[PDB]
Each structure stands twice: as structure tokens, then as C-alpha cells.
Amino acid sequence: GEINGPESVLVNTYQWIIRNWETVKIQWSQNPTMLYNKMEFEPFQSLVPKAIRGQYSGFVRTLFQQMRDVLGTDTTQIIKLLPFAAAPPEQSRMQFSSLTVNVGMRILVRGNSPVFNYNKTTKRLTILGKDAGTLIPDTSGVESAVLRG
């Protein structure tokens, strides 16, 4: 884990999700609030602007409810959005294309950003230029035909 201030809070939160991904995936499927309401996400929540925390949580929880109902368990997207579900949700009709953390820096809802960057070839997640670990259901990590020899 990292120790440099707000940045480290971000990196460390996504490292925790990756390291605990089996238990997180099952809880997200079966009983998501034991996950959304975990104290693990309190530091991440303090980085989200106070005036919009609840509106972001309403958006992500609603998105997850719809995802789950029609598709079940997109690993990268569940990991990305999860910490934003931690605040008490405020429901609204607002549709967010990005979500800000104070470190504003933007996490894009679809695809990669300077803050959150998943690499399909190495199968590792990078947060603010630091490694968060390897992402995974049926050998993990780097693809074939990367190392020439």
C-alpha cells in the first residue's frame, strides 16, 4: 500500500477490492449492502465532494440494480464504481458520465481515465499511475504473445 495522502486513499481502496475480489463479487451478487455499507469505504467517501456524495450513490446503486437484473456479474465496471455506492443514496433523475474525487479529478463511467486505467493486455489495474493489482471466472495476468522471448 501507498502512504502519500489522498492519492494513497484511492490506490489503497482499489487494491483492497482486488485483493478481496472473490468475496466482493459474491456479496455484490447476493447481499450488496454489507458491501455498500462497509467501513472500508469511509476514507474513499471523504474524497467525494460532500455536496454530491449522496446523488452519486443513488446513481451507482440504481445502475447496479439494473445491471444485476439483466446481466448478473463486468468485473472492471463493478470494481470501478463500487466505492461511490458507499454514501447514503439520494435518488435523482441525473445521469452522470463521470464521477469526481478530490485528489477535481474525474473517473469516467465508461472506459479509462487518468485516475482509473485497466490494461486488457497485462490484466492489471493502475490508479493515479500506481499498481492496484491483477483483475479476473473460468492462469491470471498477462496475455499470450506479449513477451517475444
Q: What cell does 146 get?
A: 506479449
Centroid of chain to Cα 127:
10
Residues 45 and 57: their CA atoms lie apart, in Å, by: 10
Sign of torsion over alpha carbons 38, 42, 48, 52: positive
The residue ranges of every structural domain in the chain are 1-149
Residues 107 and 48: their CA atoms lie apart, in Å, by: 11
Q: What are the strands, taking DSSP E only, across the chain?
A: 98-101, 105-108, 116-119, 124-127, 130-134
DSSP label of 51: T
Residues 77 and 104: their CA atoms lie apart, in Å, by: 21
Of 107, 84, 102, the residue nearest 47 (C-alpha) = 102
Q: What cell does 93 get?
A: 433523475
Give the H or E element holding residue 117.
strand 116-119
Sign of torsion over alpha carbons 118, 123, 128, 132: positive
Q: What cell does 69 get?
A: 437484473
